[PDB]
């Protein structure tokens, strides 16, 4: 209790220190610098901002207790800011209230004094000009009381804090957004902002009122402005359009908007993920699987990261549904052997010709397909494991009895061996002859129609991607 | 409005300007080659 | 203004024009 | 999934069908997508009441695609019901459509109008007018020479 | 209330008149309320639960006098009741076997893609149970690979409603694919195999298919023609797709600008 | 930097596809050699 009564001054002032400093500086630099920029949808204080977003993703979520960031809320809440000279005392009361909060204990105001943490931008007719900084001002106060995740009593005023960001959207929508791109600094605030606000309502039921709204949200760029803003809307419509069933698909089919064209390397490469898992519910593979492919060599900056293995995981699905299969764990990592080795289990029956195999694992983690949603590879995976097995005996056998291999590969009948080796040449696998009359398949072989137009064609597309390679190195090293 | 958002997607347009800024530097590596 | 500060903005959209057609003539001429 | 629905001889399910698209239409923007050439019979009928609403909801949902051509035509021919509504931010876009195929419009008429006119839709001409209304009546006169200029 | 909504309900309707009165009845229903959720005042769709229920035996009454795009119109509206935007979806009569109806005749469409992101809306109910849902793609299961008879033992096998207008074009549509399959290496057959796959002892239809389709109708076989490609002048075509492709490399290789 | 959002969560390779092939069946295949040679 002493012990304890030395540890607790040292926690509050480095966290008052370098939290403080870091919007004191970045965001300085943001809200007075976005006045020029002539790219201004965000700041190089705007992507700084991005960082200390992520440096607070693990160093604070909470409101913080043991009063460090309880009396930042209602420091850099208390802000008018009307015009330059009016802004030096609160320059020195940036140190005034530490000297506060040093003199005294703070006074942590949680969900009492959080709508009364609203009305300080209104303090003596205060501004709304800068909208960046309240709206930044909006969002890392009002973020970190969604990463409080309370669930209590305050999810109405973690609803009204984003009623007060719709009024931010109102002087989004409204304020004078011509050249400062205050509403683009507000569209990377925005995507933030509507991640948050959507974890609220994965929190809470369907917001179909809200999906009313994200699509007003979206379609109010284009014409507006046209920069970023659909993208992050567009794979924050996506969200939950993948996860409900109904229409929405043949959407992304239609959506002329696919291409935003960059979006830092982030929700471009997974929103080639997301358009790859909506392209494979439809059976279609080949266009699914290079960018399911792209996706996962696009974005790969961790060492098991999680969403890297969900992609990981998904990519190989079209795979055991093509017929040609690699070996997953060319990525395996230590937080991962839980992860891949049921799915492991499950490529290892398919790459065999064995049905009674792969027959087994549906009953066996139907439970795990319940957690996964891909019910969809049991309905027809058996298809093509029967043509992998029937691939791979006809590549072995130069004249097979059907009343062996059906017997063989469990079909309990020879009769149907003619139905199935007869799609095996229908369906363009197998050119094997047969006679009806004794039940016999022989098989032939040849060359050189391969060598004629087979490989030709892979090579074209090599050298076109080796090109590509080249374009792109020379359009991108020409910066200087 | 209408003679509002025409200047904002006609100053869109700037990326030609870093094409410019591209060829000119282009420009420069080779006339002081020569 | 905004009459103006929209005219004068074809201007410059022509003088990009320009250059672009330029530089293009001049990175062949100079090889030669 | 109201489309067919839009397949019954009476008005009385096809107004009902207009009530609920421009309701549901916020969910299924881009349904008509599929529904184009049944909006056409709804609209092009001369023995069809409402016909002029299937032009409107036609001119809501070639916005959503972005087809500003198709959307112009329904500018035109969606009506009086088009005219009257122009408290939104969809009035800036239909006047966007318009106004700038009115401009080149006088471009072209700024070569041969002495013969070979093409004939001008009096809503096509009705908005530049009744929209410069605005102009004329809320004190501006700046945004008012600068459209009669552009008018040519 | 309600005047007289389930009247001719359990016996029959051999008559389009009373169908008649019945379809105007769903326009008063649609003059009266919605088929839209109608926020304020869930419980005001007694008219709507029972709505419903004359829409399954106006669906009943579709299948029985075909009405094939109307039915589909009926299905659309009951599969949105039982995708409904407000989630208090209370049970109903035939929910479990009309969206079977759906799958069949979406199946006999070869609306494959449509077969299969339908299958998304009802996670275990298409998979752990409902037989009349999971029977229709255990049957689609069969008509994976190549399984002729075995399907038709499925189909010779449904104690449930008719299916019958659809499982039919469901016969023609493998009479088609035995019609299509012929043509592979089945070099001889005897025609009474061919009679028991196909369908119809000695029909006319052994007519139909080998003077429609080919295989000679001789001594007790159907014979098998040959024919080849040999890849003769094409030399040329692989010549002149190497003009286009290398002309593309030459082509890339040669920008500059 | 690139925090990458969380809503969601030779020596080893090639004889781990021959591995794939020797997994289910024969796994320590040498005693069925001694085990069949008596068997026929």
């Given at each position: 209790?002493?012990?304890?009564?030395?540890?607790?001054?040292?926690?509050?002032?480095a966290?008052?220190?370098?939290?403080?400093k870091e919007?004191?500086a970045?965001?300085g630099?943001?809200?007075?610098?976005?006045?020029?920029?002539?790219?201004?949808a965000?700041?190089?204080?705007?992507?700084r901002?991005?960082?200390?977003?992520?440096?607070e993703?693990?160093k604070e979520?909470?409101k913080?207790?043991?009063k460090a960031?309880?009396g930042?809320?209602?420091?850099?809440?208390?802000?008018?800011?009307?015009m330059?000279?009016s802004t030096?005392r609160?320059?020195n009361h940036?140190?005034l209230?530490?000297?506060?909060?040093?003199f005294?204990?703070?006074?942590?105001?949680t969900?009492?004094?959080?709508?009364?943490?609203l009305e300080?931008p209104?303090d003596?007719?205060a501004?709304?000009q800068?909208?960046?900084?309240?709206?930044?001002?909006?969002s890392?106060?009002?973020?970190?009381?969604?990463?409080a995740?309370?669930?209590?009593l305050?999810?109405?005023?973690?609803?009204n804090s984003?009623?007060?960001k719709?009024?931010?959207?109102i002087?989004?929508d409204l304020m004078?957004?011509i050249?400062?791109?205050?509403r683009?600094?507000?569209?990377?605030?925005?995507?933030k902002?509507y991640?948050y606000?959507?974890?609220?309502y994965?929190?809470?039921?369907?917001l179909?009122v809200?999906?009313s709204?994200?699509?007003?949200?979206?379609?109010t760029?284009?014409?507006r402005?046209?920069?970023?803003?659909?993208?992050?809307?567009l794979?924050?419509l996506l969200?939950?359009?993948?996860?409900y069933?109904?229409?929405?698909?043949?959407?992304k089919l239609?959506s002329?908007?696919?291409?935003?064209?960059?979006?830092?390397?982030?929700?471009?490469?997974?929103?080639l993920?997301?358009t790859?898992?909506?392209?494979?519910?439809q059976?279609?593979?080949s266009?699914?699987?290079?960018?399911?492919?792209?996706a996962?060599?696009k974005?790969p900056?961790?060492?098991?990261?999680?969403?890297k293995?969900?992609?990981?995981?998904?990519?190989?699905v079209?795979?055991?549904?093509?017929?040609?299969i690699?070996?997953?764990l060319?990525?395996?990592?230590?937080?991962?052997?839980?992860?891949?080795?049921?799915?492991?289990?499950?490529?290892?029956?398919?790459r065999?010709?064995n049905?009674?195999?792969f027959?087994?694992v549906?009953?066996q983690?139907?439970?795990?397909?319940?957690?996964?949603?891909?019910y969809?590879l049991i309905?027809?995976?058996?298809?093509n494991?029967?043509?992998?097995?029937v691939r791979?005996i006809?590549?072995?056998?130069?004249?097979?009895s059907?009343?062996?291999?059906?017997?063989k590969?469990?079909?309990?009948?020879?009769?149907?061996?003619?139905f199935?080796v007869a799609?095996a040449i229908?369906d363009?696998?197998?050119?094997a002859?047969?006679?009806?009359?004794?039940?016999?398949?022989?098989?032939?072989?040849?060359?050189?129609?391969?060598?004629?137009?087979?490989?030709?064609?892979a090579?074209?597309?090599?050298?076109?991607?080796?090109?590509?390679?080249?374009?792109?190195?020379?359009k991108?090293?020409?910066?200087? | 409005?209408?003679?509002?958002?025409?200047?904002?997607?006609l100053i869109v347009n700037?990326?030609?300007?870093?094409l410019?800024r591209?060829?000119?530097?282009?420009n420069?590596?080779?006339?002081?080659?020569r | 203004?905004?009459?103006?500060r929209?005219?004068?903005?074809?201007?410059?959209?022509?003088?990009?024009?320009?250059q672009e057609?330029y530089?293009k003539?001049?990175?062949?001429?100079?090889?030669? | 999934?109201?489309?067919?629905?839009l397949?019954?001889?009476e008005?009385?399910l096809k107004?009902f069908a207009?009530?609920?698209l421009?309701a549901?239409?916020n969910?299924?923007?881009?349904?008509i997508?599929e529904?184009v050439?049944?909006?056409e019979?709804?609209?092009?009928?001369?023995?069809?009441?409402?016909?002029?609403?299937?032009?409107?909801?036609?001119s809501?949902?070639?916005?959503?695609?972005?087809?500003?051509?198709?959307?112009?035509?329904?500018?035109?021919?969606?009506g009086?019901?088009?005219?009257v509504?122009?408290?939104?931010?969809?009035?800036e876009?239909?006047?966007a459509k318009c106004?700038?195929?009115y401009t080149?419009?006088?471009v072209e008429?700024?070569?041969?109008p002495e013969?070979?006119?093409?004939?001008?839709?009096?809503?096509?001409?009705?908005?530049?007018?009744?929209?410069?209304?605005?102009?004329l009546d809320?004190?501006?006169?700046?945004?008012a020479?600068?459209?009669?200029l552009?008018?040519? | 209330?309600?005047?007289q909504?389930?009247?001719?309900?359990?016996?029959?309707?051999?008559?389009?008149?009373?169908?008649?009165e019945?379809l105007?009845?769903?326009?008063?229903?649609?003059?009266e309320?919605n088929?839209?959720?109608?926020?304020?005042?869930?419980?005001?769709?007694?008219?709507?639960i029972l709505?419903?229920?004359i829409?399954?035996?106006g669906?009943?009454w579709?299948?029985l006098?075909?009405d094939?795009?109307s039915?589909?119109?009926?299905m659309?509206?009951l599969?949105?009741?039982?995708?409904?935007?407000?989630?208090?979806?209370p049970?109903?009569?035939?929910?479990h076997?009309?969206?079977?109806?759906?799958l069949?005749?979406?199946?006999?469409?070869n609306?494959?893609?449509?077969?299969?992101?339908?299958?998304?809306?009802?996670?275990?109910?298409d998979?752990?149970?409902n037989?009349?849902?999971?029977?229709?793609?255990?049957?689609?299961?069969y008509?994976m690979?190549?399984?002729?008879?075995?399907?038709?033992?499925?189909?010779?096998?449904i104690?449930?409603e008719?299916?019958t207008?659809?499982?039919?074009?469901?016969?023609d549509?493998?009479?088609?694919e035995?019609a299509?399959?012929?043509?592979?290496?089945?070099?001889?057959?005897?025609f009474?195999?061919?009679?028991?796959?196909?369908?119809?002892?000695?029909?006319?239809?052994?007519?139909?298919?080998?003077k429609?389709?080919?295989?000679?109708?001789?001594?007790?076989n159907?014979?098998?023609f040959?024919?080849?490609?040999?890849?003769?002048?094409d030399?040329?075509?692989?010549?002149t797709?190497?003009?286009?492709?290398?002309?593309?490399?030459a082509?890339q290789?040669?920008?500059?600008? | 930097?690139?925090e990458?959002?969380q809503p969601?969560?030779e020596d080893?390779?090639?004889?781990?596809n021959?591995?794939?092939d020797?997994?289910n069946?024969?796994?320590?295949?040498?005693?069925?050699?001694?085990?069949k040679?008596?068997?026929?």
């Amino acid at each position: 209790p002493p012990g304890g009564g030395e540890q607790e001054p040292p926690p509050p002032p480095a966290p008052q220190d370098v939290e403080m400093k870091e919007e004191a500086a970045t965001g300085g630099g943001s809200t007075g610098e976005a006045d020029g920029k002539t790219a201004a949808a965000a700041a190089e204080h705007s992507q700084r901002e991005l960082d200390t977003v992520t440096l607070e993703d693990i160093k604070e979520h909470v409101k913080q207790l043991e009063k460090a960031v309880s009396g930042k809320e209602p420091r850099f809440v208390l802000r008018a800011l009307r015009m330059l000279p009016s802004t030096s005392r609160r320059l020195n009361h940036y140190v005034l209230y530490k000297a506060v909060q040093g003199f005294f204990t703070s006074n942590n105001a949680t969900r009492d004094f959080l709508l009364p943490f609203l009305e300080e931008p209104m303090d003596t007719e205060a501004d709304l000009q800068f909208r960046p900084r309240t709206g930044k001002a909006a969002s890392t106060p009002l973020l970190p009381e969604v990463e409080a995740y309370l669930q209590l009593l305050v999810v109405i005023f973690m609803m009204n804090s984003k009623r007060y960001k719709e009024a931010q959207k109102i002087s989004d929508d409204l304020m004078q957004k011509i050249s400062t791109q205050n509403r683009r600094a507000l569209d990377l605030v925005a995507a933030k902002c509507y991640y948050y606000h959507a974890r609220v309502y994965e929190f809470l039921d369907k917001l179909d009122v809200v999906r009313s709204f994200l699509h007003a949200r979206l379609r109010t760029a284009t014409l507006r402005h046209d920069a970023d803003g659909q993208a992050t809307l567009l794979n924050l419509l996506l969200r939950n359009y993948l996860h409900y069933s109904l229409y929405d698909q043949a959407e992304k089919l239609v959506s002329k908007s696919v291409f935003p064209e960059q979006a830092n390397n982030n929700e471009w490469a997974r929103y080639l993920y997301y358009t790859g898992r909506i392209k494979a519910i439809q059976l279609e593979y080949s266009e699914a699987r290079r960018t399911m492919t792209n996706a996962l060599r696009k974005a790969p900056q961790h060492t098991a990261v999680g969403f890297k293995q969900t992609v990981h995981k998904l990519l190989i699905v079209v795979e055991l549904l093509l017929g040609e299969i690699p070996d997953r764990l060319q990525f395996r990592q230590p937080s991962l052997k839980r992860s891949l080795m049921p799915y492991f289990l499950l490529t290892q029956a398919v790459r065999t010709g064995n049905l009674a195999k792969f027959n087994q694992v549906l009953d066996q983690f139907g439970e795990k397909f319940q957690a996964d949603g891909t019910y969809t590879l049991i309905i027809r995976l058996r298809h093509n494991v029967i043509k992998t097995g029937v691939r791979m005996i006809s590549l072995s056998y130069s004249r097979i009895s059907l009343a062996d291999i059906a017997q063989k590969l469990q079909l309990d009948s020879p009769e149907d061996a003619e139905f199935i080796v007869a799609k095996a040449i229908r369906d363009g696998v197998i050119e094997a002859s047969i006679n009806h009359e004794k039940g016999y398949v022989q098989s032939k072989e040849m060359i050189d129609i391969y060598s004629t137009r087979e490989p030709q064609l892979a090579f074209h597309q090599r050298i076109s991607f080796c090109l590509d390679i080249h374009n792109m190195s020379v359009k991108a090293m020409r910066f200087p | 409005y209408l003679s509002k958002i025409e200047e904002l997607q006609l100053i869109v347009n700037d990326k030609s300007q870093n094409l410019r800024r591209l060829q000119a530097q282009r420009n420069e590596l080779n006339a002081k080659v020569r | 203004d905004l009459y103006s500060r929209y005219k004068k903005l074809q201007q410059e959209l022509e003088f990009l024009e320009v250059q672009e057609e330029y530089i293009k003539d001049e990175q062949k001429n100079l090889k030669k | 999934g109201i489309i067919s629905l839009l397949d019954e001889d009476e008005p009385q399910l096809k107004e009902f069908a207009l009530h609920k698209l421009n309701a549901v239409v916020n969910d299924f923007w881009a349904e008509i997508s599929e529904s184009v050439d049944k909006i056409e019979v709804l609209y092009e009928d001369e023995g069809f009441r409402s016909r002029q609403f299937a032009a409107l909801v036609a001119s809501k949902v070639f916005y959503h695609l972005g087809a500003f051509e198709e959307s112009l035509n329904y500018a035109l021919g969606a009506g009086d019901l088009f005219n009257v509504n122009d408290n939104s931010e969809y009035v800036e876009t239909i006047i966007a459509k318009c106004i700038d195929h009115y401009t080149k419009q006088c471009v072209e008429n700024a070569d041969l109008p002495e013969g070979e006119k093409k004939p001008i839709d009096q809503r096509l001409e009705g908005i530049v007018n009744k929209m410069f209304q605005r102009c004329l009546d809320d004190h501006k006169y700046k945004q008012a020479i600068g459209i009669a200029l552009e008018t040519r | 209330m309600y005047e007289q909504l389930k009247g001719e309900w359990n016996r029959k309707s051999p008559n389009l008149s009373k169908c008649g009165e019945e379809l105007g009845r769903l326009k008063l229903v649609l003059l009266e309320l919605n088929f839209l959720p109608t926020t304020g005042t869930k419980l005001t769709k007694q008219q709507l639960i029972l709505a419903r229920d004359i829409l399954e035996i106006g669906a009943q009454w579709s299948i029985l006098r075909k009405d094939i795009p109307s039915f589909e119109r009926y299905m659309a509206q009951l599969k949105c009741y039982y995708f409904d935007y407000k989630e208090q979806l209370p049970e109903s009569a035939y929910m479990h076997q009309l969206l079977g109806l759906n799958l069949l005749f979406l199946l006999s469409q070869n609306r494959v893609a449509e077969f299969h992101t339908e299958l998304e809306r009802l996670p275990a109910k298409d998979i752990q149970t409902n037989v009349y849902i999971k029977h229709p793609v255990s049957l689609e299961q069969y008509l994976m690979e190549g399984s002729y008879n075995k399907v038709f033992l499925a189909k010779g096998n449904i104690p449930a409603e008719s299916y019958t207008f659809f499982i039919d074009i469901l016969l023609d549509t493998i009479r088609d694919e035995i019609a299509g399959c012929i043509e592979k290496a089945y070099e001889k057959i005897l025609f009474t195999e061919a009679t028991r796959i196909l369908f119809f002892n000695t029909p006319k239809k052994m007519t139909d298919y080998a003077k429609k389709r080919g295989w000679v109708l001789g001594p007790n076989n159907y014979y098998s023609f040959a024919s080849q490609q040999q890849k003769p002048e094409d030399t040329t075509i692989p010549s002149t797709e190497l003009a286009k492709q290398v002309i593309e490399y030459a082509r890339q290789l040669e920008m500059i600008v | 930097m690139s925090e990458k959002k969380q809503p969601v969560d030779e020596d080893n390779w090639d004889d781990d596809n021959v591995e794939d092939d020797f997994s289910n069946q024969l796994r320590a295949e040498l005693e069925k050699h001694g085990y069949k040679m008596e068997t026929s």
